[PDB]
């Protein structure tokens, strides 16, 4: 009917307005990522010119991947893995780094490989393995509308706003990260390296803090 | 010709024969779950027989369908046969085992007249 044609025209106009909002937000996000990266690089250069040393800010976000399977886990690290939502091997979560989570990571260190995710691997994780939690029911993301329907009260309207709340640990990082279902990663595509996995990364194994090398591993698992 | 169906996948065409039915004549081939405490078939050791479980279940779209694509409906007479008057592409008649030679003639003639497929149009045929 003619009223139905009116609702269709109204829906397409609202969709164009939402896409203009998302487009300008993504442009602003790209501008601030570029300027923050250039600013850290120039801060290091400026301190080297002044004779000082620029200590970079400590990393606010880890990506944690459970590398060890289900059986023969002690109850305290088992509970910490369940509280970090790593309930199967090659499950990953983003974890906000504070003291209340660093002592969780120290408890589950022999069973996870964790490190500091970059924007590229965050973007590829949320683009390829990105799934929501909607009526708990694990909804694949695939559309900015289902992120606006659940995280829109926190101002997240799109998959790039969702990525932004992760990479810059925002005020609603907890709600965005808990909306994200734990990333079901594959085994790494070129192997792990490391003939034996369950020694530390320092000792020639896989587990523990893998500071900026988690991107290579997670991109191989993705 | 029947309705268009997906390709029928059976997932285990082999009969699930009982353990040691090949070994003892008292043990028939009808499937019994081995409930023994040390049973290798029950414990599922590699090299032993497969046991029936629900993962072998047929696809519901292609379940109960013969290779012609019809479900078999057992038919004892003409009144049983004409239940499939409007279901000829879905159901195929199959005359029961105890029907006379002279009654199979009229069942087959009426089924040909109705377009109903008969899966055994050769039982008790005088040649």
């Amino acid at each position: 009917a003619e009223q139905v044609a009116a609702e269709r025209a109204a829906r397409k106009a609202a969709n164009k307005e939402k896409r203009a909002i998302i487009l300008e937000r993504n442009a602003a996000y790209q501008k601030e990522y570029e300027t923050a990266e250039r600013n850290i690089i120039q801060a290091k250069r400026d301190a080297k010119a002044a004779g000082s040393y620029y200590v970079e800010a400590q990393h606010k976000l880890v990506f944690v991947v459970r590398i060890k399977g289900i059986n023969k886990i002690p109850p305290k690290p088992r509970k910490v893995l369940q509280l970090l939502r790593l309930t199967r091997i090659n499950s990953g979560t983003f974890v906000k780094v504070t003291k209340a989570t660093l002592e969780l990571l120290k408890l589950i260190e022999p069973y996870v490989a964790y490190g500091y995710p970059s924007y590229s691997t965050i973007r590829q994780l949320v683009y390829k393995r990105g799934f929501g939690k909607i009526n708990k029911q694990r909804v694949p993301l695939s559309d900015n509308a289902i992120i606006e329907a659940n995280l829109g009260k926190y101002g997240i309207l799109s998959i790039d706003d969702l990525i932004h709340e992760i990479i810059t640990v925002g005020p609603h990082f907890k709600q965005a990260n808990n909306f994200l279902w734990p990333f079901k990663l594959s085994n790494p595509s070129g192997g792990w390296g490391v003939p034996r996995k369950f020694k530390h990364f320092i000792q020639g194994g896989s587990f523990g803090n893998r500071e900026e090398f988690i991107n290579k591993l997670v991109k191989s698992m993705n | 010709a029947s309705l268009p169906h997906p390709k029928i996948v059976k997932k285990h065409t082999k009969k699930f024969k009982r353990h040691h039915s090949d070994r003892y004549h008292r043990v028939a081939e009808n499937w019994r779950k081995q409930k023994g405490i040390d049973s290798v078939v029950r414990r599922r050791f590699r090299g032993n027989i497969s046991q029936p479980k629900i993962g072998y279940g047929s696809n519901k779209k292609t379940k109960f369908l013969s290779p012609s694509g019809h479900k078999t409906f057992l038919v004892a007479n003409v009144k049983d046969l004409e239940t499939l008057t409007m279901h000829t592409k879905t159901y195929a008649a199959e005359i029961a085992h105890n029907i006379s030679a002279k009654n199979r003639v009229v069942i087959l003639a009426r089924a040909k007249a109705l377009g109903i497929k008969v899966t055994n149009p050769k039982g008790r045929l005088a040649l």
Binding site: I22, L23, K48, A49, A50, G51, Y53, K128, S142, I159 | -
Partner: protein, 51 residues
């Protein structure tokens, strides 16, 4: 019914993320930085090369 992948499938990379067209047009991921001329201090260099 089927999860089409962005990072393939430019149609889905444009359904999500309307900025992908602008990024690919301005190349924006291969953009040159300004050539500054900062020279490090002699204290930094001699601490670095120091035994």
């Amino acid at each position: 019914v089927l999860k089409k992948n962005p990072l393939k499938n430019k149609q889905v990379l444009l359904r999500l993320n309307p900025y992908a067209k602008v990024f690919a047009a301005e190349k924006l991921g291969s953009k040159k930085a300004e050539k500054t001329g900062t020279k490090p201090a002699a204290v930094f260099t001699e601490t670095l090369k120091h035994d």
